[PDB]
Amino acid sequence: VPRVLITGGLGQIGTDLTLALREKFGADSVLTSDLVTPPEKHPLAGGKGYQHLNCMDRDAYEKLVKDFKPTWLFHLPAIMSVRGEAEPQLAMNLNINSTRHALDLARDYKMRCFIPSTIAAFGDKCGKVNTKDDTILNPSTVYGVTKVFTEMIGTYYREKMGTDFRSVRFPGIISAATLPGGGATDYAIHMYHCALLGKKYVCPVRRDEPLPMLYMPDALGGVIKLMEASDSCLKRAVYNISGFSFTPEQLRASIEARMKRPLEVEYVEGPAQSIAHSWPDSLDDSNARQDWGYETKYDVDKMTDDMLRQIPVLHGLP
Amino acid sequence: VPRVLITGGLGQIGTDLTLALREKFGADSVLTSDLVTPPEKHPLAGGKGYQHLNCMDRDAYEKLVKDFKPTWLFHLPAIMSVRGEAEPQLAMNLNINSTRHALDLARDYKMRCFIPSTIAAFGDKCGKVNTKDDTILNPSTVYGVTKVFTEMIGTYYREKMGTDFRSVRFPGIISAATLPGGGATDYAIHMYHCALLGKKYVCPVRRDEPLPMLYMPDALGGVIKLMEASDSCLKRAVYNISGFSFTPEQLRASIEARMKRPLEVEYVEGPAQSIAHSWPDSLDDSNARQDWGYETKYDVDKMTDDMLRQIPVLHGLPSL
Ligand SMILES: [K+]
Ligand SMILES: [K+]
Secondary structure (H helix, E strand, O other): OOOEEEEOOOOHHHHHHHHHHHHHHOHHHEEEEEOOOOOOOOOOOOOOOEEEOOOOOHHHHHHHHHHHOOOEEEEOOOOOHHHHHHOHHHHHHHHHHHHHHHHHHHHHHOOEEEOOEEHHHOOOOOOOOOEOOOOOOOOOOHHHHHHHHHHHHHHHHHHHOOOOEEEEEEOEEEOOOOOOOOOOOOHHHHHHHHHHHOOOEEEOOOOOOOEEEEEHHHHHHHHHHHHOOOHHHOOOOEEEOOOEEEOHHHHHHHHHHHHOOOOOEEEOOOHHHHHHHOOOOOEOOHHHHHHHOOOOOOOHHHHHHHHHHHHHHHHOOO | OOOEEEEOOOOHHHHHHHHHHHHHHOHHHEEEEEOOOOOOOOOOOOOOOEEEOOOOOHHHHHHHHHHHOOOEEEEOOOOOHHHHHHOHHHHHHHHHHHHHHHHHHHHHOOOEEEOOEEHHHOOOOOOOOOEOOOOOOOOOOHHHHHHHHHHHHHHHHHHHOOOOEEEEEEOEEEOOOOOOOOOOOOHHHHHHHHHHHOOOEEEOOOOOOOEEEEEHHHHHHHHHHHHHOOHHHOOOOEEEOOOEEEOHHHHHHHHHHHHOOOOOEEEOOOOHHHHHHOOOOOEOOHHHHHHHOOOOOOOHHHHHHHHHHHHHHHHOOOOO
């Protein structure tokens, strides 16, 4: 049974991944870490199996790996699109340096090492329709720039430093738990919230701007499946993974068809749109399907049905 | 005329560029820095116009920018291909952090900022024949990795941070002044010296491995023309520049033809070969031609003639 260290585990992915992996391998085989103690409202709060770690601090990072001796590492800490634009200095600091520490430690303590990439690695030259795994990368965000670095140094580690580095490019990840932030793709989450509170939604992404999206369980399914795969199946270190591609208009319709009551949406083109427009419309994830059996269970309507049921439950909502 | 700060100036390009700009703009216009005191026998030795700078020290970097108050920055420090495989940590430390500091400084002090990229940015997926400016980048060296980062953050600074960032992808750069060492593309220099000394050369690059190469004068031509170009001609931030491509066997033929005598070469694969194999065979530099008028004056035979006259004079090797 894998011994699992997750870093940056307070995030949506880290939280759900902690829970899935406890269920899967038992609570004692999983150690989650992040900068601060879980907030009292957060799903990991109070609970044990949690450790403080600043991933920027290499010695503390090495100590934790020497102590716990994980066989799998999930290095999740990142500054994403939004905050990345507001503080490029921080983004480059955390994303680059902590990634370098993760890889060095995976090399030295022989860990299977997952560090996620993102659709933000792509920019407007990617070929926006069914974007291939191998293509021109011209990210127009710092976050994107850092994640391309991650992709390249990680792949370098796999090819030349015998390091079992593995990665996917996450599209927009949708989740019922994630209280909805400011990030590009978070509009999807926001829309469901508003639809349940019966308020008008203010959408900063163009009505007809398509984005690759993925529902959390399929995302978690993918990450775990890739982590369980055989080195000899993996022709690549970094894999696009897809759920579905949609525009705000199509998501609105999904939600309307499900609720049989209409949802008011005002398109107010924020900086999210300019970033979104530089990203792919849809992703080709055939290398993932082929190499290691990636699959998805949720189409837009199932996700809609689920989210519209799960939010009231998790958030004490109508 | 511009005020020029060159960092990492003790390398071939730094030195040669320092001289060209001393010439072009006047010695008091140019300041050159590197980590170490210039060697005894070095073009920038002794005289003023040279300063120690550790570019990984941001405060020292800013201080020197505050003192000298340049308008042109040429950030040239880098650990390159071969040394980077041996010291990947040092390569990323300097290649990434120094680059980051120069961009920040050039933004803040409004400098036109040149930071070279390289053919090492490319990997075996680039499309190796006439490699385009826009292609798949899968570098297999630490150096290449750090230079792709350079291109992307530099391009990001240009689009979003109002920073006059400009770059070329250097092919392997040949100069008569460079003393032949262990660098990825150094075989070409070695062949020239061995020709004149009349000794056998053991070549670590495969006999038929093509590489984009460029003669120093055309390299300096390109950088200076690019650094002088009007912003509104620059459709991109980073541009392939090319001179010629050739294999070891083609370079040797050029040398033989010129010297009217055989050059003895033995091909024993060294570490340069797997690096070189992952690089383009030839570059497409049409965008540099079109946008800002990049041009070249040396083909291989004209570089061969020049090298074979220049090396005897610069190094005291036996002349033709
Ligand atoms: K898009
Ligand atoms: K080649």
